[PDB]
Every structure is written in structure tokens, then in C-alpha cells.
Design a protein around this ligand. Structure first.
Ligand SMILES: OC[C@H]1O[C@@H](O[C@H]2[C@H](O)[C@@H](O)[C@H](O)O[C@@H]2CO)[C@H](O)[C@@H](O)[C@@H]1O
Ligand SMILES: [Ca+2]
Ligand SMILES: [Ca+2]
Ligand SMILES: [Ca+2]
Length: 701
């Protein structure tokens, strides 16, 4: 039974014997250590993993009627990854000295990491923060109650935890150098930078910014907007399923209140003001785009001589980070998590609508959801290109935030958000709303999406594909998007296949409202790269499950497509069960990208030497000059040279041997097989567990 499968997997995730959690009760990114993808080591963790943990405990708590584990997980999150410490040392010193009339100092982003550090020029004065005052008034504090995105759970980078030294799990930053800094190209550095590592007198600050004084010791946290929102989404479900401890409900509210910082342009510039390359500061809420941008970041001085702090929003918004279930939870009486601030609920209400419009606007001619938009073209408020489509005066982006790899190519970026739009369709209908613009947008988007996705889901059959990843039809032709895609298949009992990536081209038409939507005939998703990602399966199953369920609440029966989505969910669940290895539902994956452990592509500026967390001098001697075409002048070292303790990993030998014996450094190609791995990712196993659970809850009953 699906209930039983849910409980089984839940116990496999929680078991001390399996190693999904650290000795301190903190979920890791993955049981395995040698992995690199967003976190760059498997025993980092993320705010995403914490949010998934909460989701898992919500469903389990509903089944056992005991909420103690949900509460314990929230306390753990609070203790280790939210940098607010009522009691011990202040984890945001000098946040009180924040100046909401000058939230931060402008610096340009750059098209390559090679062009960093960027000058803190204050070229563009920052606009007004219009929520700081409400938050202070509501909570008696402006300490940001959001999860930092990245935690070094085993202190693998050896920075320690400056402001809470008895905690082994330490706050760490990576990404900080623009769209071309892949996970392989970032330099891990402590969130709390007392300059005891990095360059003497400078810490790591001078990799990223330059200014005319010596950088003070300082701290810097950065959230992920989909993580905190998924925490709130989990608390929404708990409350719907009977949870009602105020102490924790109110903590989710407070989290949603601070998450509003994700709705603001990076430097509080008026939305649209950079369209012609001359931005200007926002007044009131003029810098509020009402979307979740990729992050909000906050920082300040360390020590008695550094009494300042700052905030940034973000200008780039990615469809895959919007969470309109959280927005609903935070904005309506039926959602149940309205904040007590003066405009928290009403800002989230606008956001819910704006997120739904964004999905409709971005939906390709065939039904897939294109990338997003920005208020800062090239991250320096460049004029938008002639003819660029816009959404509320923000420029369309096919790969918001990151380009290596392009951030909306991964099919996971379809499943994740479409799962939540499906949830919201269900929620609206169950709350008695068949008529609002909001349910019509949600429904229209998800109905088209489900149609789209079902062409590339294969259960008990293996799709035919070419050596470049394209799906082929029965005549052997590449299928290059379009509706009614007919993929050729062979019989393959017990296998499943999902799409891996999308190649995007074209643009949506400029947004004019839902009543004028064009169907984006010049926006094309080519779906490719058949794979067996069990994380994506779990997320998809839930999208199909909630969507089916909604169609039956709406109409009394499963609609035509409701039936197909229900059957796809059930079939995926049944085949997936065979891939349980006793620890997780898993499959083997090839990682052709793992030549980037070794490639010399980690940039350091000229004249910069310092000490890495692991003790090694960086950049050190194992370097090549940076590429003049990327506009820097500095050097590259490798991922592996920067992190010498990786050579101590038990899997390191076999990876290096495989690289030696198979990768051709001249052609850039794996000739004799790419490295292969079988990974037990926390988020992925939770997406699987929760898929069995919700099928039982919504379909079995
Ligand atoms: O960065 C998004 C998401 O990536 C996850 O890893 C994916 C990766 O993007 C894809 O190209 C790869 O080959 O499949 C994996 C596994 O699902 C990663 O697990 C997440 O933390 C991350 O948020
Ligand atoms: Ca804390
Ligand atoms: Ca790059
Ligand atoms: Ca209580």
C-alpha cells in the first residue's frame, strides 16, 4: 500500500543506521560525500533540505497524530541554520544599525567571475526599504528570520563557527561572482569573516568587492526564496491537517514576513527604471516586483569598530523559485498564516496573483515554463535589448541568475514549481473557489503543463533518443518541441524514463494580462535527455496527483486529463518501488561534468594570496593564467587543488582513476565511460516519500 510505502521510506530516511543525518540531527545534502551540483560537497546542507525535512515530518505527524518531530525539526532549523539566536551570541551583530534609507552600496555584477572584485561605487544610490519599519515594529527586532542557504554540517571546510563555536555546523558562502560562476568555480568562504582565513588583513572580501579602505571584518548571509517558502508551505499543510500550536504557526508567519525581502530589487531601484539604462531609487514600494527573486542577502560588521549593516534584495526572478501555496498561506483567512505586520498579508496577496501571472506569461507554445525575468539587465541596470519581451517592465530571461549550466534547462525546474501550482489548483477548488482569476490562471497553466509533460513520461517502455539527447519519433526524426509529440519507444518492463533538460529558444510575448495572453507562439521548449531521476519522479507524481484530485473536486470526477495524470502517478509509484535499495529509491547516474573537479577554472585576482579553510595557500602554485577574453587578470586553480581534503574522500581514488583512464583533456570528452554514481539525496528521498503519502491521502483516501 502507498501508506505503507510512505512509512517505510520515512523510517529509511530517519534511521540512524543510514546516515542521512549528522550526529547533531541535521540532514545532509546526501548520504554520499563526493558529489557536486549546488552544494559542492555532500555533507554540506541547504535550506532546501531543511524545508524538505519539515514537509516530511508534517505528513508523518499527520499520520501518527504526533507533532513532536515537526517541532523538533523546526527547533533544529532554528538552532543551526537560521542566524537568530535569542539567548547566546548575536548572530547578526550590528543589524540594529541598518540604514533603511541606504540599504546597501551599489556594485555591478559581471558576466564572468574574472571581473571580480567589483567596485563598491555607490554609482546608483540605493532606494528606500519600505518594510524594515514594519518588521521592527511587529517583532521588536530586524534580525532576519530566514534560513541561510548553505551550512557546513561536518565543518569540512574547517572554518569553524565564529559566533556559535560549540556548533560544529558552520555558516558558509560560495556563489558570489555572477552568472558564469558555476558550482565548480566558486570559493567557499565563511559567512562570518573575521579575516583569520583568506588574505591577511582582508579575509575573502577582496575576491568579491573593492573599496578604497581595507575591508572590515564582517558577516554575510543569503537565503534561497524557495526554501523558506517551502517551510511555510509545509506549515500550511500541517495546519490544514490539524496542527495548531501557535508557537510554531507564529514562527512560520514571522518567516513569511521577512521573506518579503525577496520581493525587492537588489538595490531597491524602481521596477522598470533600468529599461533604458538609467535606473533610479525606489520610493515607497516602487522597488517591489512582488515576485520571489532568487535571494535576499544581509550583512554587517564584526567587532566593536564595525557598526554598520546592509540588505539587498535581488533583481533576477526565476519561475522555479515562486511558491504561490506559501503566498496563499500568508495572504488569506483560509491560508491561516497571515503575518501580524501591517502589510505582510496584503503584499503576499499581490504576490500570489503576480506569481500566477508570471507562470502564464512564461508558458511556452507547447506548455513548458520558461525562465523568468530581471529588473537589472546584465546585473548593472543595462538598457534592455531592442525588442526584449517584458513582464511588469522586467526583461524576459531564459536563464535567470546562472548560466553554467543555464538555470532553467533542468527538468527539475519544471516539476518543482508545477507541483505547487497543482497543489494550489487543488487548494482553491477545495476552498470553494472555481471562479477567481487566480484559480483560472493556476488551472490553465497546470492543465497545459500536464498535457505537455505526459508526452515524455515512460513507464515500462524506453524512449528512443539519439546520441545528442534528442527524443526521436517513429520515423527516426528529432522531436523539436511542439504539441502532440510522439516519442518512439521499445518495451522495457520495470523501467521508467523522464525528461532531463529543455533547450529554450525565442521569447514570450510581452505581458498584457491574462485576458490578452497570446499563447506565446514564438517561445519554444525542446525537451531532451531521457533520465531516471527519482527526485524528479517524486515531485512529478505529486504534481499529477494533486492535479487529478483537483479535477475531481471541481467536476465530481476525474477529467480526461485528470484520469491520465492519476494513472501516470500510480504507474510511476509502482515502478519506482522496485528501485528501493533499502536506504532510498535510487538509480545510477552518469556525471560527465566531473571533469570539472580537475579543470583549472577557479579564478583568483592578481596579487591575492591567502589561506583556505583547509589550510592550503590559495591560489597556490597549481594555476594557469585567466582567459583574457573574460576580461580579468588573475589565474585559475582547480576545484580539487582548492579543496585538498577531497583527496581523503573514499570515492576520490576511483574518480581520479576514471578521469585518468577515460577523459581526454584535448577534446574535452569522456572516451571510455563517464563516472557513474548512485546517490541518496535527502530532498530526492523526501520527494519520493511524500509522493506515496499524498497519493494515499488524495486519491486512495
Ligand atoms: O540547482 C538545482 C538543484 O540541482 C540538483 O541536482 C540536479 C542537477 O541540477 C541536474 O542537472 C543533475 O544532473 O541531477 C541532479 C539531481 O536531481 C540538486 O540535487 C539540488 O540541491 C539543486 O537545488
Ligand atoms: Ca540560530
Ligand atoms: Ca563558468
Ligand atoms: Ca506552544
Amino acid at each position: 500500500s502507498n501508506k505503507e510505502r510512505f512509512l517505510t521510506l520515512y523510517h529509511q530516511i530517519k534511521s540512524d543506521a543510514n546516515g542521512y543525518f549528522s550526529p547533531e540531527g541535521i540532514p545532509y545534502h546526501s548520504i554520499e560525500t563526493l558529489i557536486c551540483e549546488a552544494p559542492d560537497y555532500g555533507h554540506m546542507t541547504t535550506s532546501e533540505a531543511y524545508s524538505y525535512w519539515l514537509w516530511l515530518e508534517v505528513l508523518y505527524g499527520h499520520y501518527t497524530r504526533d507533532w513532536s518531530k515537526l517541532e523538533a525539526a523546526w527547533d533544529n532549523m532554528e538552532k543551526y541554520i537560521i542566524p537568530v539566536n535569542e539567548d547566546g551570541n548575536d548572530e547578526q551583530p550590528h543589524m540594529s544599525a541598518y540604514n533603511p534609507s541606504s540599504p546597501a552600496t551599489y556594485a555591478s555584477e559581471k558576466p564572468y567571475p574574472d571581473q571580480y572584485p567589483s567596485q563598491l561605487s555607490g554609482a546608483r544610490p540605493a532606494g528606500q526599504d519600505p518594510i524594515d519599519g514594519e518588521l521592527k515594529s511587529t517583532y521588536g527586532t530586524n534580525e532576519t528570520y530566514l534560513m541561510h542557504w548553505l551550512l557546513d554540517v561536518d565543518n569540512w571546510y574547517k572554518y569553524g563557527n565564529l559566533l556559535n563555536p560549540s556548533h560544529k555546523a558552520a555558516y558558509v558562502n560560495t556563489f558570489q561572482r555572477g552568472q558564469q560562476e558555476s558550482v565548480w568555480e566558486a570559493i567557499p568562504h565563511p559567512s562570518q569573516d573575521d579575516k583569520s582565513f583568506g588574505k591577511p588583513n582582508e579575509g575573502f572580501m577582496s575576491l568579491f568587492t573593492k573599496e578604497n579602505q581595507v575591508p572590515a571584518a564582517q558577516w554575510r548571509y543569503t537565503n534561497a526564496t524557495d526554501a523558506d517558502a517551502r517551510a511555510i508551505q509545509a506549515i500550511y499543510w500541517a495546519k490544514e491537517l490539524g496542527y495548531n500550536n501557535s508557537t510554531y504557526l507564529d514562527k512560520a508567519k514571522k518567516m513569511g514576513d521577512f521573506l518579503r525581502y525577496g520581493m525587492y530589487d537588489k538595490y531597491f531601484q524602481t521596477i522598470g527604471s533600468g529599461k533604458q539604462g538609467n535606473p533610479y531609487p525606489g520610493n515607497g514600494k516602487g522597488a517591489c516586483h512582488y515576485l520571489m527573486a532568487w535571494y535576499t542577502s544581509w550583512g554587517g560588521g564584526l567587532g566593536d569598530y564595525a557598526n554598520w549593516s546592509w540588505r539587498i534584495g535581488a533583481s533576477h526572478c526565476h519561475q522555479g523559485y515562486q511558491n504561490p501555496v506559501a503566498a496563499y498561506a500568508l495572504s488569506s483567512d483560509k491560508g491561516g498564516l497571515k503575518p501580524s505586520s501591517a502589510t505582510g498579508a496584503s503584499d503576499w496577496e499581490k504576490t500570489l496573483k503576480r506569481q500566477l501571472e508570471f507562470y502564464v506569461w512564461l508558458q511556452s507554445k507547447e506548455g513548458a515554463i520558461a525562465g523568468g525575468a530581471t529588473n537589472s539587465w546584465n546585473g548593472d541596470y543595462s538598457a534592455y535589448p531592442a525588442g526584449r519581451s517584458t513582464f511588469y517592465d522586467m526583461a524576459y530571461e531564459d536563464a535567470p541568475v546562472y548560466h553554467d549550466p543555464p538555470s532553467n534547462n533542468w527538468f527539475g525546474m519544471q516539476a518543482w514549481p508545477m507541483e505547487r501550482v497543482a497543489e494550489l489548483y487543488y487548494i482553491f477548488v477545495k476552498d470553494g473557489d472555481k471562479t477567481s482569476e487566480n484559480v483560472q490562471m493556476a488551472k490553465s497553466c497546470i492543465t497545459k503543463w500536464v498535457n505537455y509533460a505526459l508526452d515524455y513520461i515512460f513507464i515500462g517502455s524506453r524512449p528512443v533518443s539519439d546520441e545528442e539527447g534528442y527524443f526521436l519519433d517513429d520515423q527516426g526524426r528529432r522531436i523539436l518541441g511542439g504539441t502532440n509529440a510522439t516519442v518512439a519507444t521499445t518495451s522495457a518492463p520495470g523501467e521508467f524514463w523522464l525528461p532531463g533538460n529543455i533547450a529554450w529558444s525565442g521569447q514570450p510575448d510581452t505581458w498584457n494580462g491574462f485576458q490578452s495572453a497570446t499563447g506565446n507562439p514564438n517561445l519554444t521548449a525542446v525537451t531532451k535527455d531521457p533520465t531516471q531521476d527519482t527526485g524528479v519522479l517524486g515531485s512529478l507524481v505529486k504534481a499529477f496527483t494533486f492535479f487529478a484530485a483537483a479535477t475531481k473536486l471541481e467536476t465530481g470526477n476525474y477529467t480526461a486529463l485528470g484520469v491520465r495524470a492519476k494513472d501516470a502517478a500510480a504507474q510511476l509509484l509502482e515502478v519506482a518501488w522496485n528501485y528501493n535499495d533499502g536506504v532510498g529509491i535510487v538509480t545510477e547516474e552518469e556525471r560527465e561534468d566531473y571533469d570539472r573537479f580537475f579543470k583549472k577554472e577557479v579564478y583568483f585576482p592578481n596579487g591575492w594570496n591567502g589561506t583556505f579553510g583547509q589550510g592550503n595557500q590559495i591560489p597556490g602554485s597549481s594555476t594557469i593564467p585567466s582567459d583574457p577574453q573574460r576580461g580579468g587578470n588573475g589565474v585559475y586553480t582547480s576545484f580539487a587543488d582548492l579543496r585538498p581534503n577531497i583527496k581523503q574522500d573514499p570515492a576520490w581514488s576511483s574518480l581520479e582513476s576514471k578521469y585518468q583512464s577515460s577523459f581526454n583533456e584535448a577534446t574535452g570528452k569522456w572516451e571510455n565511460g563517464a563516472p557513474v554514481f548512485t546517490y541518496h539525496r535527502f530532498w530526492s528521498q523526501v520527494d519520493m516519500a511524500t509522493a506515496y503519502a499524498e497519493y494515499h491521502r488524495l486519491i486512495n483516501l
